[PDB]
Amino acid sequence: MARCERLRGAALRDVLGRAQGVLFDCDGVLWNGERAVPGAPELLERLARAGKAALFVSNNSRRARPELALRFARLGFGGLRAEQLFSSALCAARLLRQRLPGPPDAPGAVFVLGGEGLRAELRAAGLRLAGDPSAGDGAAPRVRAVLVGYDEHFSFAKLREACAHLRDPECLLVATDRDPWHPLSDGSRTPGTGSLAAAVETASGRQALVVGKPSPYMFECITENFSIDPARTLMVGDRLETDILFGHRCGMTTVLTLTGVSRLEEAQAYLAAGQHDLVPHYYVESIADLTEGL
Amino acid sequence: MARCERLRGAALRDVLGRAQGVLFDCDGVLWNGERAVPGAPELLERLARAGKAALFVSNNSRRARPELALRFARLGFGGLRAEQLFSSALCAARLLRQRLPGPPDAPGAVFVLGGEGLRAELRAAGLRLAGDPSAGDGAAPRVRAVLVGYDEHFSFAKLREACAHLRDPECLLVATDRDPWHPLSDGSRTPGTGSLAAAVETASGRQALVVGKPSPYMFECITENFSIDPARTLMVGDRLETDILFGHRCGMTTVLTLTGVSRLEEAQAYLAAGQHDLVPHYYVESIADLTEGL
Ligand SMILES: O=c1cc(-c2ccccc2)oc2c(O)c(O)ccc12
Ligand SMILES: O=c1cc(-c2ccccc2)oc2c(O)c(O)ccc12
Ligand SMILES: [Cl-]
Ligand SMILES: [Cl-]
Ligand SMILES: [Mg+2]
Ligand SMILES: [Mg+2]
């Protein structure tokens, strides 16, 4: 079982050598804000040269795929294909396309708590949004899902409207992620989607379907068109309750990096409490410590 | 132990006859919106004539005491003294006066998520509010508590600011109540303070101190200046998880009325699960069914 071992030396060479691919979280792992983790671009170059696949899995719902790719490029992570990038915005759009109830003759609409990047991803997946223009003089379509994402314009009015839609038990409640907060460059924090989802769940008396990590649905989304063997894939992240739990649920070897949110002391506390699904198999100070294993 | 018995006949005469006073919740008990429960004003008149004390305990944080009294009067509940009326706004103001940390030479300030009635109650208790005018050219005072109440102007910006203040571990987090939602006359619902508190707690990683029912603090507040013997007091409410739990925690005989939020089926389910602190001792269809016992 996971023992939170510092990955180095011969063990590092064996773990990386056997791996066919690596799944990376982005924030806290590849970069912090507009600052790349030193050595992280070189790791990705070396992984590609070694024939090992790299995929990127982020709970960040702020950017549609084209703008998500831009952040990678300007921080040194070159040569990446858009098909390597998975966000909770992209995967929530796909889940809604797959699960929106209602008849095919009258597609439902999605009431979105979130920003323009998320809305763009939803429309690109063919979804119609509450508040988009209605057809001719016709009435507004029936709202068949509420989607909670990262919404810097969240308000009591929007919360009340979400509850009005959720009065219909057949209306879905979906959240992009349950991350409670995020650290910012200046040392402050911003509320996360999990805090907004908590309000919607509490006021509506519903439980949300969560798209992003640690939900296994995120793994279905990334593998819909890419064959990855979880027994041969490393999951690298900075958050115990999202990245590491995700890896355990999917059968992946997990690596905690310490350049982000979770601390080594927290991982060791979970291990002492016996909560092994929150314990990384391995940790590194930063992902630059993985490059020597190639 | 509580068995959720319909209170009537000789048992009703014995329960009411032995009681020295009755504590009533307001919404769902005395009235629904601007409609008094028929027979409720007459019950209060008869209780007073019988020499039994009546007190009113509400989690509603929207009205300061003077405006709270107005609703009673226009719905038929005459002859009431302001000292009989206790709200979570009044009791949160008193708790903050009693517990605000910091030195006496520099009083702290309270950052309030809530409306003008709540703010008025706080100022009347001597508290200074974040955003009130600063003295001369001096800087803004240190925020030493965040108070979450019913805030129809809640926003992401206000949530983020609350978290900035709560970064200081010595800053208190207080909530007026944890009621998750409330029913409206038209059949819709409005989000409750509990939904906003859930967001603040989740984004800040804190647990709030809750003033209102079912917290025992509400009982300390009402009895600070009124001697009531809980063994001789009936607690009458419409919500299992707030009024009935409150009564059990305080040692009062509890009566569920069915003119509000909780349903008889829910009470019976708690009893079958053995969750006796959520089980009323007695229930009535409406509080008008209590009058015959006098
Ligand atoms: O710098 C960061 C920014 C963010 C962020 C996510 C959504 C909206 C706004 C900001 O999230 C982070 C994160 O979750 C980490 O694990 C580590 C770092 C960050
Ligand atoms: O008609 C009602 C209105 C409200 C209300 C409380 C705070 C803000 C806005 C509305 O709360 C209720 C309640 O909690 C009940 O138990 C029963 C009825 C009501
Ligand atoms: Cl929308
Ligand atoms: Cl304030
Ligand atoms: Mg991260
Ligand atoms: Mg009530």
Author numbering:
A (entry chain A), B (entry chain A): 1 to 294
Quoted from the paper:
PDXP is a member of the large family of haloacid dehalogenase (HAD)-type hydrolases. HAD phosphatases are Mg2+-dependent phospho-aspartate transferases that consist of a Rossman-like catalytic core linked to a cap domain. 7,8-DHF binds and reversibly inhibits PDXP with low micromolar affinity and sub-micromolar potency.
In contrast to murine PDXP, 7,8-DHF bound to human PDXP with a ratio of two inhibitors per homodimer and well-defined density. Interestingly, the orientation of the inhibitor was markedly affected by the presence or absence of phosphate. In the absence of phosphate, the inhibitor is flipped horizontally, with the hydroxylated chromone substructure of 7,8-DHF now located closest to the Mg2+ ion (compare left and right panels). Inhibitor binding in the absence of phosphate is primarily stabilized by metal coordination and hydrogen bonds, as well as polar and non-polar interactions. The 7-hydroxyl group of 7,8-DHF is involved in an octahedral Mg2+ coordination, albeit with an elongated oxygen-Mg2+ distance of 2.7 Å, leading to the displacement of a water molecule. The 8-hydroxyl group of 7,8-DHF forms a hydrogen bond with Arg239 and His182. The ketone group of the inhibitor participates in a water-bridged hydrogen bond to the carboxyl group of Asp27 and the backbone amine group of Gly33. Interestingly, Glu152 (or Glu148) and Arg62 can form an intramolecular salt bridge that obstructs the active site entrance. This interaction was observed in phosphate-free 7,8-DHF-hPDXP and phosphate-free PLP-hPDXP, as well as in apo-hPDXP and apo-mPDXP.
